[PDB]
Write a protein that binds this ligand. Structure first.
Ligand SMILES: CCNc1cc2oc3c/c(=[NH+]/CC)c(C)cc-3c(-c3ccccc3C(=O)OCC)c2cc1C
Lengths: 186, 186
């Protein structure tokens, strides 16, 4: 494909090198397509990167819905989502390029637009879990939105900053966190 | 002193121009030293930088040692420590060079190992809070090493992926997290 085969070459690049580290010159060569091409449906570079973040967020959200069936109660869904977070191939892998990207493009009032666009799509799973858990009487959370943002970010932090200790240790610290957290909601 | 001069000159060089832009040639001349001296003390730019990172972490501790006195209980120190980590990054100078360096040498066996020892120093601040909170029946934690690692990364998450929200909202969410988390230990 075209725009679709570029979005891949980019993803690979942003993940492998970082937001700046990778350039359009690079993208184009390996993607194999005149630069101008990129300019059509991919206005700027933020547009391309912001693009990938959306697809990646969506791919992940989709994977989770197709896997959350294995968790009967919302309590389990909390535990599970946080566990899978550590192993997916989606979105989380380029959380580091997001750190760059923000610091490097953080002074454009276009900053909080698509950038908050994601916030909402990223804390969604938690909103459902807690909301539904509230209905489902698994706990009573007066401020679902606050708790979802906290959980989302706390978890993202655990997945992103412990990227060296052996995988199974991670799975366990994560489960201890999920435990302490939910325990604090009651 | 000349070693100290170099570190000082280099730190400010990193702040203004960032990690990748700062050159050792500039570091050598502005500190009135020499390539050879720089080599003898640090071997490489990467290494000189990690060195600064270590000096900075000690200042942080010294700072924390003087600040925690304002918090009588450990429950209090936890809240206070999480809030300081959030507010200071708003204006920590090197923060950028760090984000820049952090990703550059994030897949490097050598550097990544040294960096992990650096975070360990951060993580200890929590260890102390939890061990002491134990000896005071503020809570009972039988896996302090684990809970410390969780606090650190959870907090880091909240501090890192939340720059779009306004500072009052971020601080409110952080104190809420501290509350939720702390509650899950009783
Ligand atoms: C009141 C003066 N304020 C300070 C504020 C700080 O805010 C920081 C925010 C961050 N924001 C999230 C992306 C990250 C990553 C590191 C920080 C460090 C840090 C940087 C390099 C090497 C060691 C440390 C360090 O302190 O390491 C162990 C504690 C830091 C240090 C001091 C003194």
């Amino acid at each position: 494909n075209l725009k679709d085969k570029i979005l891949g070459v980019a993803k690979e690049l942003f993940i492998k090198n970082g937001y700046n580290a990778t350039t359009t010159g690079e993208i184009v060569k390996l993607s194999e397509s005149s630069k101008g091409n990129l300019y059509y449906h991919f206005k700027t570079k933020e547009n391309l990167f912001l693009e990938i973040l959306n697809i990646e967020e969506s791919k992940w959200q989709e994977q989770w819905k197709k896997e959350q069936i294995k968790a009967k109660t919302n309590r389990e869904k909390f535990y599970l989502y946080n566990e899978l977070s550590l192993t997916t191939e989606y979105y989380y892998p380029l959380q580091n390029a997001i750190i760059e990207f923000y610091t490097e493009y953080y002074k454009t009032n276009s900053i909080n637009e698509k950038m908050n666009k994601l916030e909402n799509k990223y804390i969604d799973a938690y909103h459902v879990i807690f909301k539904e858990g509230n209905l489902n009487g698994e706990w009573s959370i007066n401020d679902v939105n606050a708790v979802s943002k906290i959980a989302a970010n706390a978890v993202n932090g655990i997945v992103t900053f412990t990227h060296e200790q052996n995988i199974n240790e991670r799975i366990k610290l994560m489960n201890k966190f999920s435990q302490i957290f939910l325990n604090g909601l009651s």
